[PDB]
Design a protein around this ligand. Structure first.
Ligand SMILES: CCCCCCCCCCCCCCCCCC(=O)OC[C@H](COP(=O)([O-])OCC(O)COP(=O)([O-])OC[C@@H](COC(=O)CCCCCCCCCCCCCCCCC)OC(=O)CCCCCCCCCCCCCCCCC)OC(=O)CCCCCCCCCCCCCCCCC
Ligand SMILES: CCCCCCCC/C=C/CCCCCCCC(=O)OC[C@H](COP(=O)(O)OCCN)OC(=O)CCCCCCC/C=C/CCCCCCCC
Ligand SMILES: CCCCCCCC/C=C/CCCCCCCC(=O)OC[C@H](COP(=O)(O)OCCN)OC(=O)CCCCCCC/C=C/CCCCCCCC
Ligand SMILES: CCCCCCCC/C=C/CCCCCCCC(=O)OC[C@H](COP(=O)(O)OCCN)OC(=O)CCCCCCC/C=C/CCCCCCCC
Ligand SMILES: CCCCCCCC/C=C\CCCCCCCC(=O)OC[C@H](COP(=O)(O)OCCN)OC(=O)CCCCCCC/C=C/CCCCCCCC
Ligand code: HEC
Ligand code: HEM
Ligand code: HEM
Ligand code: HEM
Ligand code: HEM
Ligand SMILES: O=C1C(=C2CCC(c3ccc(Cl)cc3)CC2)C(O)=C(O)c2ccccc21
Ligand SMILES: O=C1C(=C2CCC(c3ccc(Cl)cc3)CC2)C(O)=C(O)c2ccccc21
Ligand SMILES: O=C1C(O)=C([C@H]2CC[C@H](c3ccc(Cl)cc3)CC2)C(=O)c2ccccc21
Ligand SMILES: O=C1C(O)=C([C@H]2CC[C@H](c3ccc(Cl)cc3)CC2)C(=O)c2ccccc21
Ligand code: FES
Ligand SMILES: [Zn+2]
Lengths: 81, 239, 67, 378, 56, 164, 45, 54, 54, 54
């Protein structure tokens, strides 16, 4: 079936490659890779983060409320006698 | 609801810190002379003390102190004999109904995993042992209960089990309640998890190895993928 | 005769401000509950608050005196 | 020809993982299937060893595990490995599902359906292993899960009593749990092979959602070394969890043996289940609760049917992405609610989280897809 | 020209697959012992006074 | 090329170390546990064993024979020619007192228990594949390669013996 | 690599580096060549 | 095409035991393989049941 | 082709095997049975006459 | 050849299985069968006894 002899039909594309032993494995990290990671974080920040911030607010609120609910109310004894 | 135990600075809590075996040796005396009246420790035997705080001969000596049932003999009858290394610490009661009958309806639990079966571990137990006090105003206790804020409910059947000079340690340490509690707690830690020290020993090695193998294999990957990472294309139609 | 370090350490911690305010609240609640004729209130919550506050600083300073 | 292609067994291996054409551009999210397989293998091995020391009897189960962890040489670490491997297995499983939801790989219908089958099987297996120690939590977990069939209106109670083998949970039920837990993993293995057979007829989707037949590379050497790297990382994490912090995920209430007369005040299943538990807790009706419980997972089967977009992947669809991450947070919320007592704040929050989960899958995503289409003018 | 270290290493050992394999077994034999000894030393040193080997 | 291959070498060395450790500890899971390895001694009262009687006792999971031999047996066991044996040994190399002999009742071929006072030789006969022993426990016919094993013992009374 | 799927047949060439005119080794290499030079239409060393 | 030949799982079944070409003249001695398979299946089922009580 | 010829032929073979198996199970269950395996195990005595499964 | 060799493998496997089922009742014959079959590896000259005990 699917085999490297007849996958698709292409015309007029040229490629060039070096061998691994001719070139470096980690050529430019701090001059190219770091800024690229930075933009890659920039492009997705506001699509992911705010939902989790909202989750954090909800969690803390619900915890606080549950913990208030367990403390004794002075009006339950002071009001009528 | 129950009061949250504070964190005490236990010397074995570091990532690669071992247990203090002196404290184990003293805690075990506490568990002989006091705590093995009510409580069972069904999953520990004398052979387990060998190489931890005792030689084989001295552990046999401990064993020898106790009578144990055995048989049948050649006549078909049971008998009593002195203990051996392969015998389990003896039970205080024959059955749980008898245990309840001797403690006004309450059943003392088995302390073989008490430190792993409670929230807070040895912080809780210490807190429980040192923590008895007189009740607040408005509170009352039914027949045969004590007050203790670190118990869920604050009413507990167990009377305060330890006090100063309730025993004497063979190494001359002064037997204040606090010292006794800390030591028995160390001993319960050891009873719940014998593999502790060897586990940390073994972590150092194989973690060093697995940490080493990451950058090496990453380098191999980068080597194989450089062919594609630097590839250059062009489009040249006759136009 | 032996003096248990825990006694002294408690007595020392109980001098601190965060303990003192809770201790005062405890006294106030004792006074109410003792003064009434017939009530269902009890003074336990206040006691537990005070004990939480105090045992926090006992735990930072007890084990230095033990072996 | 080379021997690589001389013979059916060898040629199937070759078409599977030597000369298979893979996309050049797939990312780390595609490593989690191989890690799943690794985890299955690990579980089977460690299980076959444990099996030779465990006792499927209610009067010795607990103590057989005590024996394993105290007297068997390095038995403690074998126990630790089994228990932590299950957790890793589910971590990988969840991430594996989520990928496919994000990148639109559910359009491979056969692979997707066999995946749903596998999810169900793995969950059954994990639960039937969780009750074998016969601790205090294990017992009541068994009880609840076997009472679930009482909700079937006409025949339910009889089904419950026919699964128990008696008037109640007891010795005859534990051996059933153990036989089933023994046999299921191998059915899982066979179905995994079918799963991959179905996959290799089309090949892998990729992050861009467009056809990659102009830039296929062979599986060997590229993805061989890549997956080996992934495995090394998984082993580092697993070792640190096994040796440096074994008690992180552990539950104390299962170190107390079973007591048929007392349920403990605070109930909590294993973490990978909490969310279902929350869902089950949220409906004030028995039958409705169970129905929701099962629909929560069965709903994946109609996602392919509700797909309106012209594009396959969310890579180029921002509104879609926003909704995706909101759904993930709803699931986190259900997990958190599952841990808490059944008290009023958490009751109300859980009900909202459940309604929003189904709402989002069934309504909001389809409609956002239509809006998106209109914004691109088709 | 420049007889350099890695080139000698390639030409003597790594060029032939059998000898590469032999090099690997020989290296692991000695790595194992050195590595064990170092680890045990560190471990013993972190918690002197608390192990029963010496208390004995 | 050298440098790139050195990296691979080193990686392989580490992987071999880790693999060895894992596989070996798994294998050591299946050896005897720390509750199976008890080794006690056993004391036998000899005044309950008539002359000509073979008694069997359970010891370390296996039979232990005690045999109280008669005079003609003591006589005729000494006559044997040691050259016609596959595991040559004299009777007095195998007993401490002539009228008592103590053996481990396990067949040296594949482990069945010999029946006493049976076979061609007045000693023991093993039904499983047909090996014959003499009243010294010496192998005389059939597929077994060795004589029956003699444990360490000593006499604490003229009517008490301890095997350990 | 220059890809054009409309041409009837694929042409391929693969070399390593040879020593040059001056070296003696050439002779032996030629012998090797003659030893090497079915699947396809056309082939040469 | 018929569905018999539309699909890998189905086409493997078909090549196995629907459209497989068999000799016309083989005798009873060739029935014992299928009986072996039957026996294996019987053993597995009865064993899974016994297992739950042993 | 395998179907229908050898399908029905093997079904016939299976019917025959089931007849034999039922008669062995219900009409004469003790034919191949061994009495010495109805005595529980005794590590101290091997029985005089030893015989494995047929 | 391939079918024949896989058949030999299957014969061996089936025999192992049958024997390991025959010892499960723990009757008097089962016990001594176990004993003999597990002592078989003592015949390996250098490592046998240790294999038996393992
Ligand atoms: C209380 C318990 C009750 C139990 C009840 C059991 C009832 C069972 C009923 C079974 C009914 C089966 C019906 C099957 C129909 C299938 C039709 C078909 O297509 O068949 C094709 C098949 C043949 O296939 P094929 O394609 O020709 O290929 C085969 C060859 O390749 C062909 O090669 P060839 O052509 O060269 O071969 C020619 C010739 C080759 O001939 C020879 O080789 C020569 C033979 C010479 C024999 C001479 C006599 C004996 C020797 C004497 C020698 C002299 C001794 C001198 C001694 C001197 C001493 C001093 O071979 C034959 O012709 C053989 C035909 C006869 C087959 C018999 C089958 C017996 C089955 C027994 C089953 C037992 C188990 C039952 C369950 C028990 C449960 C407890 O069979 C037939 O054609 C015959 C069908 C009819 C068979 C009937 C069998 C009845 C058995 C009844 C037994 C009752 C007693 C049980 C006792 C139990 C004790 C524990
Ligand atoms: C006594 C102590 C132990 C001694 C151990 C010694 C062995 C050590 C390990 C050696 C590993 C094997 C290395 C050599 C493998 C050679 C394989 C070979 O020649 O076959 C290659 C060739 C490749 O096929 P094509 O692609 O068609 O080739 C066309 C080329 N244009 O053939 C094949 O297909 C592969 C055949 C593989 C055969 C492998 C044989 C393995 C033998 C192992 C013996 C182990 C003995 C252990 C004894 C232990 C003590 C009792
Ligand atoms: C032991 C306790 C375990 C608790 C549970 C653990 C599992 C759940 C973990 C939840 C958090 C996961 C965070 C993962 C990292 C997210 C990083 C991120 O936002 O990156 C966005 C970045 C954007 O890239 P692109 O759109 O492709 O374009 C870039 C190329 N130009 O990547 C992505 O969006 C890829 C998203 C892939 C899917 C991720 C799925 C994560 C959650 C899956 C499990 C959730 C539960 C199960 C869900 C399904 C239930 C039916
Ligand atoms: C409520 C009580 C229970 C009621 C049960 C009712 C059902 C009773 C049993 C009915 C069995 C099925 C009979 C009809 C099958 C029709 C199959 C069909 O149409 O497909 C044939 C056609 C053949 O393929 P080609 O060769 O390509 O055809 C080309 C022709 N030139 O299609 C196929 O490939 C086969 C498709 C099979 C579909 C089978 C559907 C089965 C549905 C079963 C429903 C059971 C419901 C049970 C409910 C129980 C109570 C909750
Ligand atoms: C157990 C916990 C271990 C934890 C440590 C990490 C484990 C994972 C480490 C990676 C394991 C990789 C296993 C799979 C093999 C990967 C091979 C690889 O990447 O190299 C490719 C390369 C293929 O060569 P090419 O250059 O592509 O073709 C040349 C044609 N002229 O692979 C080879 O070298 C193939 C030849 C065999 C190599 C050896 C295979 C492994 C076995 C060797 C040791 C044998 C004894 C094993 C005993 C095990 C215990 C009983
Ligand atoms: C008889 C006088 C006892 C002695 C001596 C000791 N304990 Fe005990 N213990 C006893 C009873 C009757 C109970 C039941 C309490 C109840 O409310 O049911 C207990 C309980 C414990 C517990 C359980 C704590 C929990 O939260 O469940 C622990 C951890 C415990 N006891 C520890 C302990 C120790 C260390 C002792 C020796 C210093 C000891 N106990 C002695 C009765 C008796
Ligand atoms: C034991 C459980 C499972 C195993 C072992 C397993 C294994 C695999 C493997 C090895 C792959 C190869 C590609 C990859 O790794 O991404 C894969 C792909 C895939 N899996 Fe599974 N899987 C399992 C469960 C699931 C589940 C639960 C689902 C969906 C709910 C699923 C759906 C898919 C899909 C759709 C693909 C192909 C998607 C693509 O290539 O883009 N699988 N699986
Ligand atoms: C997908 C594969 C598997 C999964 C997810 C799985 C999961 C689990 C889990 C979660 C437990 C309980 C862990 C604990 O109590 O700490 C368990 C226990 C057990 N499993 Fe597995 N298992 C798998 C495969 C197997 C297999 C193939 C066997 C074969 C016998 C097996 C045998 C056992 C045994 C004997 C136990 C009880 C021992 C114990 O609790 O430690 N398991 N399993
Ligand atoms: C569980 C054990 C086995 C099963 C389930 C099995 C199954 C089968 C089946 C269904 C066939 C189809 C043709 C026929 O029935 O004759 C077959 C053929 C065959 N079997 Fe097996 N078999 C088993 C064991 C063996 C053994 C032990 C051998 C040889 C020592 C063997 C060698 C063969 C051969 C050579 C054929 C083809 C011969 C021919 O077609 O002329 N098999 N087997
Ligand atoms: C080729 C497949 C099988 C063969 C040849 C086989 C054979 C046997 C035999 C001969 C016995 C002893 C019969 C007796 O003592 O009367 C036995 C017992 C047993 N087998 Fe099977 N068996 C097979 C498959 C299975 C499977 C898959 C299981 C799954 C659990 C199983 C479970 C058992 C059990 C529990 C026993 C003991 C019960 C008893 O002795 O009645 N067997 N087996
Ligand atoms: O990891 C695989 C993979 C497979 C590799 C080999 C694995 C494997 C697992 C266990 C064993 Cl014993 C052997 C191989 C199974 C997964 C497979 O089939 C794909 O199609 C695929 C596509 C893209 C990215 C990764 C993969
Ligand atoms: O019986 C078979 C057979 C096969 C039929 C289907 C059987 C079978 C067994 C179990 C199930 Cl669940 C399904 C099918 C297995 C044997 C098979 O593959 C052959 O090639 C063959 C050739 C000649 C004569 C008979 C046969
Ligand atoms: O009350 C419960 C409970 O409700 C469950 C539930 C959790 C969800 C499970 C579940 C069932 C089906 C699926 Cl597809 C997924 C999860 C079923 C058992 C438990 O697991 C449990 C464990 C221990 C004590 C009590 C309990
Ligand atoms: O003495 C034996 C004995 O020798 C075997 C033997 C039979 C042949 C077996 C065998 C081993 C290997 C193969 Cl490939 C085939 C059969 C091994 C056990 C038994 O089965 C047996 C059962 C019960 C009591 C005693 C005995
Ligand atoms: S076992 Fe005694 S002769 Fe074989
Ligand atoms: Zn270790």
């Amino acid at each position: 079936g699917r085999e490297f002899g007849n996958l698709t039909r292409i015309r007029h594309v040229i490629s060039y490659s070096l061998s691994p032993l001719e070139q470096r494995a980690l050529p430019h990290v701090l001059s190219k890779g770091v800024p690229n990671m930075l933009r890659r974080v920039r492009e997705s920040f506001f699509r992911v983060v705010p939902q989790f911030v909202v989750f954090y607010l909800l969690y803390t609120w619900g915890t606080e409320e549950f913990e208030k609910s367990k403390r004794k109310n002075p009006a339950a004894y002071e009001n009528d006698k | 609801v129950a009061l949250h135990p504070p964190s005490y600075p236990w010397s074995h809590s570091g990532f690669l810190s071992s247990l203090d075996h002196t404290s184990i040796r003293r805690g075990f005396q506490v568990y002989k002379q006091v705590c093995s009246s009510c409580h069972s420790m069904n999953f520990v035997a004398y052979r387990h003390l060998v190489g931890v705080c005792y030689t084989e001969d001295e552990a046999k000596a401990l064993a020898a102190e106790v009578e144990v049932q055995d048989g049948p003999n050649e006549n078909g009858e049971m008998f009593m004999r002195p203990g051996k290394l392969f015998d389990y610490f003896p039970k205080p009661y024959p059955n749980s109904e008898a245990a309840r009958a001797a403690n006004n309806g309450a059943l003392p639990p088995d302390l073989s995993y008490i430190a792993r079966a409670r929230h807070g571990g040895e912080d809780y137990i210490f807190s429980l042992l040192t923590g008895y006090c007189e009740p607040p105003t408005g509170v009352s206790l039914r027949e045969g209960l004590y007050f203790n804020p670190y118990f869920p409910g604050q009413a507990i059947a167990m009377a305060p089990p330890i006090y100063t000079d309730v025993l004497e340690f063979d190494d001359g340490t002064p037997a204040t309640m606090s010292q006794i509690a800390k030591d028995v707690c160390t001993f319960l830690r050891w009873a719940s998890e014998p593999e502790h020290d060897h586990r940390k020993r073994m972590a150092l090695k194989m973690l060093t190895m697995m940490a080493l193998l990451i950058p090496l294999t990453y380098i191999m990957k980068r080597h194989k993928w450089s062919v594609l990472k630097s590839r250059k294309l062009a489009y040249r139609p006759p136009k | 005769e032996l003096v248990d370090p825990l006694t002294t350490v408690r007595e020392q911690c109980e001098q601190l401000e965060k303990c003192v305010k809770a201790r005062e609240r405890l006294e106030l609640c004792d006074e109410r509950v003792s003064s009434r004729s017939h009530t269902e209130e009890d003074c336990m919550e206040e006691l537990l608050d005070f004990l939480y506050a105090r045992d926090h600083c006992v735990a930072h300073k007890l084990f230095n005196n033990l072996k | 020809t080379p021997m690589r292609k001389s013979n059916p067994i060898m040629k199937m291996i070759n078409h599977s993982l030597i000369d298979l054409p893979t996309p050049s551009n797939i990312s780390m999210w595609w490593n989690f299937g191989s890690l799943l397989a690794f985890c299955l293998i690990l579980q089977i091995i460690t299980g076959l060893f444990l099996a030779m020391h465990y006792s499927p009897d209610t009067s010795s189960a607990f103590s057989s595990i005590a024996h394993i962890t105290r007297d068997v040489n390095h038995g403690w670490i074998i126990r630790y490995l089994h228990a932590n491997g299950a957790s890793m297995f589910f971590i990988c499983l969840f991430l594996h599902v989520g990928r496919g939801l994000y990148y639109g790989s559910f359009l491979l219908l056969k692979t997707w359906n066999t995946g749903i089958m596998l999810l169900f099987l793995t969950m059954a297996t994990a639960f039937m292993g969780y009750v074998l120690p016969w601790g205090q939590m294990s017992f009541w977990g068994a009880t609840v899960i076997t009472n679930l069939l009482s909700a079937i209106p006409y025949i339910g109670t009889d089904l419950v009593q026919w699964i128990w083998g008696g008037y109640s949970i007891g010795n005859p039920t534990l051996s059933r749990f153990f036989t089933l837990h023994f046999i299921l993993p191998f059915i899982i293995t066979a179905l995994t092979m079918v799963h991959l057979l179905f996959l290799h007829e089309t090949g892998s989707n990729n992050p861009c959602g467009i056809s990659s037949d102009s830039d296929k590379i062979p599986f060997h050497p590229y993805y061989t070394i890549k997956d080996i790297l992934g495995l090394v990382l998984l082993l580092f994490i697993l070792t640190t969890l096994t040796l440096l912090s074994p008690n992180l995920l552990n539950d104390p209430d299962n170190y107390i043996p079973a007591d048929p007369l007392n349920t403990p005040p605070h109930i909590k299943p294993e973490w990978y289940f909490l969310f279902a538990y929350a869902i089950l807790r949220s409906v004030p009706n028995k039958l409705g609760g169970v129905l929701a419980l099962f629909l929560s997972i069965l709903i994946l089967s109609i996602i392919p049917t509700l797909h309106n977009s012209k594009q396959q992947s969310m890579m180029f669809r921002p509104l879609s992405q926003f909704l995706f991450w909101f759904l993930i947070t709803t699931l986190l919320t259900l997990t958190w609610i599952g841990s808490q007592p059944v008290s009023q704040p958490f009751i109300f929050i859980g009900q909202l989280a459940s309604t929003m989960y189904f709402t989002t899958v069934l309504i909001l995503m389809p409609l956002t897809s239509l809006i998106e289409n209109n914004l691109l003018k088709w | 020209a420049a007889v350099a270290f890695t080139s000698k290493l390639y030409s003597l050992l790594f060029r032939r697959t059998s000898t590469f394999a032999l090099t690997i077994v020989v290296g692991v034999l000695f790595f194992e012992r050195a590595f064990d000894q170092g680890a045990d030393a560190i471990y013993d040193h972190i918690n002197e006074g608390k192990l029963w080997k010496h208390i004995k | 090329k050298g440098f790139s291959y050195l990296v691979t070498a080193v990686t392989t060395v580490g992987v071999a170390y880790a693999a060895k450790n894992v596989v070996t500890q798994f294998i050591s899971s299946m050896s005897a546990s720390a509750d199976v390895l008890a080794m006690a001694k056993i004391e036998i009262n000899l005044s309950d064993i008539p002359e000509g009687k073979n008694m069997a006792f359970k010891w370390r999971g296996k039979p232990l024979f005690v045999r109280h031999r008669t005079q003609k047996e003591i006589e005729q066991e000494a006559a044997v020619e040691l050259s016609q044996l596959r595991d040559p040994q004299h009777d007095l190399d195998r007993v401490k007192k002539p009228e008592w002999v103590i053996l481990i009742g396990v067949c040296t071929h594949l482990g069945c228990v010999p029946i006493a006072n049976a076979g061609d030789f007045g000693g023991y006969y093993c039904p499983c594949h047909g090996s014959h022993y003499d009243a010294s426990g010496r192998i005389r016919l059939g597929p077994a390669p060795l004589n029956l094993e003699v444990p360490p013992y000593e006499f604490t009374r003229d009517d008490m013996v301890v095997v350990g | 690599r220059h890809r054009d799927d409309a041409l009837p047949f694929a042409h391929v060439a693969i070399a390593v580096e040879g020593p040059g005119w001056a070296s003696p080794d050439n002779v032996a290499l030629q012998v090797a060549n003659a030893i090497i030079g079915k699947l396809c239409q056309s082939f040469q060393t």
